[PDB]
Design an enzyme around this catalytic site. Sequence first.
Site, PDB file in Angstrom:
ATOM      1  CG  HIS C  49      -1.670   1.340   1.346  1.00 15.29           C
ATOM      2  ND1 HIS C  49      -1.841   2.773   2.061  1.00 15.29           N
ATOM      3  CD2 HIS C  49      -3.311   1.090   0.464  1.00 15.29           C
ATOM      4  CE1 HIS C  49      -2.705   3.231   1.609  1.00 15.29           C
ATOM      5  NE2 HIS C  49      -3.461   2.360   1.388  1.00 15.29           N
ATOM      6  CD  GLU C  52      -2.935   1.893  -4.327  1.00 12.93           C
ATOM      7  OE1 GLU C  52      -3.121   1.601  -2.908  1.00 12.93           O
ATOM      8  OE2 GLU C  52      -4.258   2.969  -4.316  1.00 12.93           O
ATOM      9  CG  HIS C  53       0.517   5.929  -0.132  1.00  8.49           C
ATOM     10  ND1 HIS C  53      -0.431   7.628   0.194  1.00  8.49           N
ATOM     11  CD2 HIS C  53      -0.959   5.421   0.086  1.00  8.49           C
ATOM     12  CE1 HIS C  53      -1.038   6.641   0.935  1.00  8.49           C
ATOM     13  NE2 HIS C  53      -1.574   5.732   0.797  1.00  8.49           N
ATOM     14  CD  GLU C 122       3.051   9.711   0.477  1.00  9.87           C
ATOM     15  OE1 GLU C 122       1.887   9.529  -0.254  1.00  9.87           O
ATOM     16  OE2 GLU C 122       3.055  11.307   0.052  1.00  9.87           O
ATOM     17  CD  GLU C 129      -3.989   6.219   3.450  1.00  5.66           C
ATOM     18  OE1 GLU C 129      -2.800   5.920   3.288  1.00  5.66           O
ATOM     19  OE2 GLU C 129      -4.666   6.244   2.196  1.00  5.66           O
TER      20      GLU C 129
END
Lengths: 124, 54, 438, 383, 75, 61
Positions: C49, C52-53, C122, C129
């Site tokens: 994940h 993906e960022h 990030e 998140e």
Amino acid sequence: ASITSVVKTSELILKSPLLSKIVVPLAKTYVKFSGYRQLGFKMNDLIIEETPNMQLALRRLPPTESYDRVYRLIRATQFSLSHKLATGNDITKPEEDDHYLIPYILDVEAEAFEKDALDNLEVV
Amino acid sequence: ATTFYNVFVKRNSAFVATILASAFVFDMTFETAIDNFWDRINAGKQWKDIRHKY
Amino acid sequence: VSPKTRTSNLKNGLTIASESNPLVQTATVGVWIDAGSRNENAYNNGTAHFFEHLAFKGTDKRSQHQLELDIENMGGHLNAYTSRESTVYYAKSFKDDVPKSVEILADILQHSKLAESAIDREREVITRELEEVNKQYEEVVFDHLHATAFMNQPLGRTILGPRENIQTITNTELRKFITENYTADRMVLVGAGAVDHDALVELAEKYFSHLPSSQSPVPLGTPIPNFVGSEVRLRDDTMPVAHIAIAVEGVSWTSEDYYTALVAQAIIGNYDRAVGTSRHQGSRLSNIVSENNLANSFQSFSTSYSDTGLWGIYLTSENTTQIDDLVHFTLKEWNRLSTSVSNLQVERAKSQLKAGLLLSLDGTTYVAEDIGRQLTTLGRRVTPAEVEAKLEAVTEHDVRAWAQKTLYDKDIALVGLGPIEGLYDYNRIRNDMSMMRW
Amino acid sequence: MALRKKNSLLNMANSYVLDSPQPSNLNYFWNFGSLLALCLVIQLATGITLAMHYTSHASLAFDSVEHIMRDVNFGWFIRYAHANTASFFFICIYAHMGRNIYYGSYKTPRVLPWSIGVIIFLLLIITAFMGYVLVFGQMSLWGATVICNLVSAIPWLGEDIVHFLWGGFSVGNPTLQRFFALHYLMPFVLAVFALLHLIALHTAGSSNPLGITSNVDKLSMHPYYSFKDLITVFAFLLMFTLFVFFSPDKLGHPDNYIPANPMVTPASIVPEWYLLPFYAILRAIPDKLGGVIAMVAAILILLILPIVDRSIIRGNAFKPISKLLFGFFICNFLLLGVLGQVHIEPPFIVLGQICTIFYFSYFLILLPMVSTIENIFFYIGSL
Amino acid sequence: YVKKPSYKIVPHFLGFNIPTVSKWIPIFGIWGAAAGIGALFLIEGVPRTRQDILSKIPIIGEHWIREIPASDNPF
Amino acid sequence: GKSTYKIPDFTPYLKKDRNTDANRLFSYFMIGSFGMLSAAGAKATVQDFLSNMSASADVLA
Ligand code: HEM
Ligand code: HEM
Ligand SMILES: CCCCCCCCCCCCO[C@@H]1O[C@H](CO)[C@@H](O[C@H]2O[C@H](CO)[C@@H](O)[C@H](O)[C@H]2O)[C@H](O)[C@H]1O
Ligand SMILES: CCCCCCCCCCCCO[C@@H]1O[C@H](CO)[C@@H](O[C@H]2O[C@H](CO)[C@@H](O)[C@H](O)[C@H]2O)[C@H](O)[C@H]1O
């Protein structure tokens, strides 16, 4: 028995000329001897209401019809407990004995019976 | 185990029928077993053991 | 009758699969990868994940800003999502902007910078998140459902990963992940809409030819999960709506019972008080729930993975004193898949599914998603004629036999969130998985 | 909040006897329920007191009843009160059941209190039958013999069951001592079922003589129905007084003042009057098992009234034909009663069979037909 | 082209239909067996049950053929 | 301590073969045995107890 049943059978009789000629006069006498009009009731006020279908039909009455029905039930209850009969304008005249509830209950039952049928459909 | 489960246990009707049938068997066999064991631990004492003299 | 899905391979083993529609003017091209969070261990959980960022944070050529501009100039958009078993990166564009989009996707997958400065930036975004998923109740419920059903196993882990890992993910482990997993034999280049297959194969030969092949190429959609009957209760009296999921172990993509499980799922079906038609649906549970106001909604699901699945229902309700009735009536409807279903329900559900499986694919993104999902789970696109035949093969005996071994008297995984005081303890829920009268 | 509402125990009493919302138009036939409660209270008080003086052993039973009459202070009154109140209990229960049938109290939503009511009626019959045996006079013994021998009709095991009930090979001491223990118990079981049928009724409330909802117009149970109940309590106590003090043996059989003698058979063995209709029904069927089934069916058939009444209207107040049919049904039930105590002779044998057919055809044929036709007449007649 | 969906209404009564009831016929069977076994078990002690049913069962039936010696019987 | 997705440790209690028919069958064997002895005990109890109502020894004499 369902109101649907009663209404359909009645319509079979009213169609047959012979049958109507003999049944309609009897039915009118029966209603006269029944004597519910002498307590200021309309026929439909007497129908059993403690059923899901009937509770739904009564909720669909227009507010005016509903308030008038409540008054006729209270008024008839007061005649009953006093052992008196209606007089004058309290007596239901034959022209006032309208089937105010029958259309609502027939629609409630129509859907209820269609739902039962469709619950038993078989894809062909 | 799958077979046994599927036949005797899965349906409660079958489970209860198996339990009742087993209870019937248990009842009859346990009766006979205890009767014999009781007769052995109390041997020579019971009427059935002396009855032959009379 | 839909156009045929064309399929070609490259030398490295990259599959190209396309379905043209000359009636649309847009095209969805993208890369479906047979890889996701489940490929991580406990130490690097969250990596997929995280990547993906970073995939959108700049490449060896285009910087972050140049990347933004290049896509803006294309006219369409790029999108990505990482799941437990699948990762997707796609680009929706105009017909003639397809070579640009293939080039950008090839760049962000093969040649991404993964610069320590960007990792560090990030690392805070992803940390935020963790505290905002909390609002997406359906997702909270399903992530707890996986965590408990597959307790301490890879399918049980979340996609975001723990807070601890987010703070310790390095560019090294990111690079290692995508080098081990993003291999040509695990990837499918998919095009749907206004795409030519032969054009797409040429673009694949131009951009994805220097992809590594894995040492041991297994077929696409190749995987041992041990389901735990269990419960998570997240009671929160201040929420007005209860969210409840109940599931049993379901079926994998390639199970022989895959269609039988879908038909069984369609017999219960979905319900939503906000939709006008829902009060008239044929499903028994629908009728019970709507007549008695037991729920705002319910949604039956049958989620599949390569080697397992979860089959169950997700319920939402404000009726907090009748949660017991809601759960009771739902599980008694499941009992009837074992005891009572006949040709009546089975043929009705088959009718509804024969259309439903085709209706779902109503745009280029849905078509691309269907080609990509099927190619990465089954190794092939299954034609609607084959699907129609597999559905037709499902009988009432199949449904009963499946429910008797999958549902009847089985352990459930249960998650409740919100005002769930009325949800009884595990035993009373699990006791409704059978009927004493049968 | 008032204590009668706040405290859970007080609130249960409150809900049944004080704030209970009643229709404002109950007539005097709604008073039999409280009369039955009164009979039950009198039978408990007199019955427990008789048990303090009665001896259940067959060698002493009949004499212990004479000791009650002769030596115990007010024993004559307690004995006569208990024996007469058993008859009043049945008058009130037939009235209460007749009210229920005429006014459609068995219809939805009151099927459950009615169905439990039918079991109450069966328990009252058993209770009264066992109590009558306890005197151990001639009718006591011979009534026990003939009624208990009906069980011999049960196929295969019938004879075995009879010997098991008797605790021997004929009615004797074992049977009397067990009937005492069961006669003492059965009234407590009866009180529980009476309570159950009221709790079941409380969901709909009392019906009313017009057959319509009373949700529009309710009166508290107290003081209105409390004070209206006192009138019928005092009317009942006047009738009680006339029998107990001035004619205590009018409702009884003289043969019960002769001690049980298994050798001599009395001229006519009949049940107490309140069982007579069921005995006439049994005589009507020539087969033994047939007759037993018919007799039981005559009570259990009450359970189908909710189904066979097809009327869209509750009760008979506005149904002239149903009222005529009900009148014939009631008078037929009284004729069956009379035929239960005549000799088995012409022409009463055939008459008993015709009355039995009428009894059953009310439930199976006439009420379903008449209620169907009246539905049509109400609809057509009011168009 | 299809103008109408293709279906029939199966006969039903009190919310039962023949397809459904037919699935439960075997279950009534087993419950009937359960009730039979249970009833028979309850009256196994009754002498008539032994005389007429249980002693007639082959092999097993001798379990219920038991005589009191005339020397040991007061009656 | 904080994450609710990290299930607490159940390894001290979890059975490895929890989804097998053998595993369920064992527990139903215990339940069934219990039901069997309760049925046999009830039958014995009822039979011996109710026999008090059959003719007593002095009556049979
Ligand atoms: C519904 C309640 C009852 C009914 C209908 C009922 C009925 C009867 C009847 C018909 C008799 C025969 C009376 C006679 O002719 O001499 C009787 C006798 C008797 N009852 Fe009851 N009874 C009831 C409650 C009780 C209770 C609760 C007891 C408590 C023990 C009891 C104790 C007796 C006794 C001892 C006798 C025999 C003495 C006698 O004949 O007077 N009864 N009963
Ligand atoms: C010990 C015997 C009984 C007692 C003490 C008793 C008592 C009562 C009482 C107090 C009520 C409410 C007041 C009333 O309507 O009179 C009532 C209602 C009722 N009882 Fe009974 N009862 C008895 C036996 C029976 C029997 C044998 C039946 C039926 C076969 C029955 C059926 C009903 C029904 C249907 C009602 C509701 C009637 C209505 O209000 O419309 N009861 N009972
Ligand atoms: C008639 C004999 C006198 C003794 C009373 C009988 C004793 C046993 C009765 C208890 C059985 C429970 O009975 C049940 O009680 C509750 C409260 O008491 C009643 O409840 C009713 O009254 C209370 C307030 O009075 C309200 O909160 C409620 O909305 C209303 O339904 C039920 O309608 C009744 O069915
Ligand atoms: C709904 C339930 C069904 C009806 C219930 C049946 C009621 C009575 C049935 C049988 C009762 C008597 O049945 C009889 O019981 C006694 C035990 O009690 C048994 O007697 C056995 O054990 C007793 C002691 O336990 C010994 O004294 C005796 O020597 C031995 O034979 C008889 O073998 C059986 O024939």
